Design an enzyme around this catalytic site. Structure first.
Site, PDB file in Angstrom:
ATOM      1  N   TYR A   1       0.766  -1.202  -0.041  1.00 48.28           N
ATOM      2  CA  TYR A   1       0.102   0.098  -0.028  1.00 48.28           C
ATOM      3  C   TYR A   1       0.795   1.195   0.070  1.00 48.28           C
ATOM      4  O   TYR A   1       1.728   1.268   0.582  1.00 48.28           O
ATOM      5  CB  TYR A   1      -0.847   0.165   1.362  1.00 48.28           C
TER       6      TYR A   1
ATOM      7  N   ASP B   1     -13.911   4.670   1.975  1.00 46.56           N
ATOM      8  CA  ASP B   1     -12.731   4.655   1.970  1.00 46.56           C
ATOM      9  C   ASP B   1     -11.641   5.889   2.123  1.00 46.56           C
ATOM     10  O   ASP B   1     -12.035   6.602   1.253  1.00 46.56           O
ATOM     11  CB  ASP B   1     -11.906   3.657   0.763  1.00 46.56           C
TER      12      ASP B   1
HETATM   13 MN   LIG Z   1     -12.656  -2.085  -3.061  1.00 46.61          MN
HETATM   14 MN   LIG Z   2     -14.473  -0.090  -0.422  1.00 45.52          MN
HETATM   15 MN   LIG Z   3     -12.673  -0.300   2.733  1.00 46.28          MN
END
Ligand SMILES: [Mn+2]
Ligand SMILES: [Mn+2]
Ligand SMILES: [Mn+2]
Ligand SMILES: [Mn+2]
Ligand SMILES: [Mn+2]
Ligand SMILES: [Mn+2]
Ligand SMILES: [Mn+2]
Ligand SMILES: [Mn+2]
Lengths: 282, 282
Positions: A89, A120
């Site tokens: 990430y 997110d």
């Molecule tokens: Mn996703």
């Molecule tokens: Mn998501």
């Molecule tokens: Mn998520």
């Protein structure tokens, strides 16, 4: 004050991280307020995955008090692969509590249903965060990721405690202080699952990052979807565990859920298979 | 069999890694044979720095048996900074034993004196190596880095055990299976020290990676320089410790040197300052 309660060793199926409010376990999905400072647009971000790591950790919708655990695929612990020139990430990754990408409705801007999860957040600050950390961030922009055909917005944010925070006020500032980051971010979400055999993902608006105001509107929208959900008014809650210990007005409120959570049992990280080292040139 | 003897905890000033040959410490600079297979040109590479790490560990020229110790800057441990889009080192980094970049003479190719150290090796395999590991690699090519104005060749190589080794035979194969790695390699070495106040580095040959044949010639010449040095025939050894326990014919040969090394005292890795997390956009 928020702390974490770890059960088991990291990188194992038994690993769970509960978020504690003053020593008491609370739902990481429902009990942490979305806004740290509403009118100043400061939000509480729950960190799931530290930058430069691979273990796909996530708040689990199906367990009580929604602990963070490692996602699995076909009974096996899930790890995201390294795709050149990235190492795992490239942002501290997490979600905003009290939000929900409604799977029951097609979203107008993306023309697709939501992915059934809190919205997110990509936190771009210099410091690497820790799993289960609750941090205050300010929104800078947002990207419309269609992940495997589902609406999956990615909010671009920064820890208010970052040295650069005062100099970043809208999406144009990200390209100024972090040149190439937005380009690398678009690429990352497009290709990260190809090593798993999944097709490349796509972005609405041609991958364009919308500004802070647009980001705020989407966040509030997903917050309203959550309000409906937690009240028990969703047409289909998908088995999401709605237990919470701070919203007495809701039907799933339960003060006793906290006491039922086992004590910490922090063990040393378990080893990760060497295959995760591999750098894919896709 | 080559093993390692660790003194202290990783990431501390007291950390040392000696290379052992059948249980006995040997010089990492002089006692490890350059060729593992001379006829097939398989080389022995001593690993200093694992991929995606920051501690600038190096074979020490001034310490007996030349253990790997972390470089220091102003009394503190030296770490290389993360420069976007890279995380630490992008290759398993090390050197070929029994080689020397002669600082006493200007090299015809680059018109600069050597950097006074074993020739450098970039190992591009999928597995992350460990400090003090002796691995067998095949040479694919070489880049002429002028580091702060000194001849500082970088050999491109791959572990013969890597799944792709059979397929990689010359420099062209690197771009064929690792597209972009060479360009990223060129950029990494040009900019990694800018965050330290250093001016950008340069490469001779327009930064082009020369082929295997060319690389073999350069390695041979650095091997011949070392032969002069270890023999005691250099006009100036710059204070390098030439103690060895496997070359009887040399004036600095001393078998008792192995016995003087204290026993292994491995400790768990010490924490690294969070400031090392920082990603620089330069
Ligand atoms: Mn996703
Ligand atoms: Mn998501
Ligand atoms: Mn998520
Ligand atoms: Mn998921
Ligand atoms: Mn050096
Ligand atoms: Mn070196
Ligand atoms: Mn150098
Ligand atoms: Mn060098």
């Amino acid at each position: 004050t928020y702390t974490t309660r770890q059960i088991g060793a990291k990188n194992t199926l038994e690993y769970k991280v509960y978020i504690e409010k003053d020593g008491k376990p609370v739902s990481a999905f429902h009990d942490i307020p979305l806004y740290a400072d509403k009118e100043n647009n400061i939000f509480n971000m729950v960190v799931e995955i530290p930058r430069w790591t691979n273990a796909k950790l996530e708040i689990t919708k199906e367990e009580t008090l929604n602990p963070i655990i490692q996602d699995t695929k076909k009974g096996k612990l899930r790890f995201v692969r390294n795709c050149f020139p990235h190492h795992g990430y490239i942002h501290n990754y997490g979600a905003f509590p009290q939000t929900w990408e409604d799977p029951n409705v097609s979203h107008p801007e993306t023309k697709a249903v939501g992915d059934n999860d809190p919205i997110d957040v990509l936190e771009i600050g210099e410091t690497i965060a820790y799993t289960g950390q609750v941090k205050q961030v300010k929104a800078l922009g947002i990207m419309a990721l269609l992940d495997e055909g589902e609406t999956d917005w990615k909010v671009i944010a920064i820890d208010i405690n970052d040295p650069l925070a005062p100099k970043l006020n809208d999406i144009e500032d990200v390209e100024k202080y972090f040149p190439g980051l937005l380009r690398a971010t678009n690429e990352w979400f497009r290709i990260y699952k190809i090593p798993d055999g999944k097709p490349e993902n796509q972005f609405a608006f041609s991958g364009e990052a919308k500004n802070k105001k647009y980001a705020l509107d989407i966040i509030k929208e997903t917050h309203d979807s959550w309000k409906q959900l937690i009240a028990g008014k969703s047409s289909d809650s998908k088995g999401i565990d709605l237990t919470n210990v701070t919203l007495p007005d809701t039907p799933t409120y339960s003060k006793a859920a906290s006491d039922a959570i086992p004590p910490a049992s922090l063990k040393a990280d378990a080893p990760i298979d060497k295959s995760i080292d591999k750098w894919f040139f896709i």
